Ligand SMILES: CC(C)=CCC/C(C)=C/CC/C(C)=C/CSP(=O)(O)OP(=O)(O)O
Ligand SMILES: CC(C)=CCC/C(C)=C/CC/C(C)=C/CSP(=O)(O)OP(=O)(O)O
Ligand SMILES: [Cl-]
Ligand SMILES: [Cl-]
């Protein structure tokens with residue numbers, strides 16, 4: 001019986017693994033051959049997982065089933081999907097993925113993105129994927145920082161205000177009381193402030209995983225976030241160029 | 254596709270119907286023949302729905318499928334089920350019920366009762382019930398007031414603090430942001446304070462339904478709660494006795 005929304009192997013690994021950077025591969029932009037090359041290096045660096053994520057997607061199932069299979073044949077790290085949900089479908093899913101990160105956008109003015117996407121997703125389970133083969137679900141509070149009209153237009157999010165800690169303190173009460181597995185602090189166009197990362201680490205339970213991403217391009221940035229309490233520092237764009245091997249070594253340093 | 258968690262016919266009915274009392278029949282204590290007699294009177298009184306609810310239950314599907322059918326044969330009012338969920342199963346459900354009230358116990362120290370029961374329930378859908386025939390789900394923020402070790406032991410709830418509005422204001426933000434359909438204020442052993450009812454009415458969206466229940470035994474109490482903002486005032490125990498007709502008449506404000 002699939003753990004589904006209950007803690008399983010992937011969450012256990014994220015809870016126990018040494019904190020560090022995590023490369024995020026956008027499967028709708030990165031050719032699969034390049035993802036496979038990258039996955040082999042991520043393995044050598046001992047990263048906790050390979051995340052495949054993108055704001056945009058189409059023909060999810062026919063594209064992702066073989067992409068996930070190719071990445072999984074290239075690394076023993078778990079492959080975790082992270083994409084926004086769509087009303088009428090819920091979150092996208094394909095067989096073979098180890099886990100799907102389910103973001104509850106608590107800062108959204110649209111209740112579907114705050115959490116009803118989770119009900120639609122679970123109602124649709126198991127669909128065309130054998131139950132035994134379904135991915136695990138990582139229940140995550142997802143928060144956005146800085147001006148970001150793209151996520152705002154698409155998902156209804158409003159940038160979190162840190163002029164006081166009232167707004168984030170409410171999200172931390174939800175994260176704790178609702179037993180979320182992870183919190184994901186994201187900034188599409190700016191940087192999540194290290195002080196907000198510290199505030200979250202201090203307010204979360206010891207087993208709640210803290211992920212931060214957005215415009216991380218240097219090892220100094222990774223270090224600052226980990227020093228602030230992030231368990232994982234995600235980065236995508238820094239490697240979306242020909243000289244990615246150099247960029248990866250500087251970020252993983 | 255059944256509406257399921259999306260608004261449907263029952264929530265529309267509750268939103269549009271005028272505020273008033275609602276009798277709650279405990280089907281694991283009330284014989285079905287008495288429930289059927291009761292259901293016929295509730296209809297004449299103009300109540301908005303008939304709730305079948307209980308903290309305790311056993312052999313739910315064999316007892317409730319026919320119990321629901323018997324009640325529905327006696328009244329055209331929607332029949333709504335309200336029972337706590339159980340790990341491994343989620344909320345109990347039978348074919349024929351018009352809706353299930355799904356309580357998210359925000360005051361519980363156990364995340365399963367705060368909301369993961371909702372995930373287990375939806376993962377299990379549709380189970381043995383034809384999909385087209387599933388009840389609608391009324392997403393509800395459920396809060397408890399006063400000392401109540403029974404619900405505390407069973408569901409992990411802690412009485413809501415009414416010393417200030419700090420705790421209830423966080424629940425109101427959740428009720429609004431999460432788009433809950435209803436809020437249910439309950440007191441097993443005391444009375445929900447009318448001022449808390451007012452505070453919720455004022456902070457909720459116009460389409461969010463406010464239910465209050467617990468030890469309501471007089472028409473005066475129903476009036477006070479409606480005057481404070483409740484959409485529906487529930488009552489069960491007052492009618493679990495032989496002279497229930499007279500009690501019902503008094504509570505309905507006859
Ligand atoms: C808003 C949110 C957290 C969750 C909702 C669901 C969405 C939009 C998922 C897409 C996955 C993400 C956040 C990809 C951007 S990697 P990055 O932008 O951090 O990469 P970068 O290193 O800046 O290129
Ligand atoms: C705690 C909560 C709201 C939801 C969690 C799920 C539970 C325990 C559902 C049982 C349904 C209830 C609250 C029945 C009591 S009617 P009453 O006790 O109000 O009737 P009374 O008129 O006092 O007899
Ligand atoms: Cl794993
Ligand atoms: Cl802060």
Ligand SMILES: [Cl-]
Pocket residue numbers: 106170171174426427430
């Ligand atoms: Cl909130």
Ligand SMILES: [Mg+2]
Pocket residue numbers: 026028029053054055056
């Ligand atoms: Mg993309």
Ligand SMILES: [Mg+2]
Pocket residue numbers: 122123124125126375376377378379
């Ligand atoms: Mg399902």
Ligand SMILES: [Mg+2]
Pocket residue numbers: 279281282306307308309
């Ligand atoms: Mg009972």
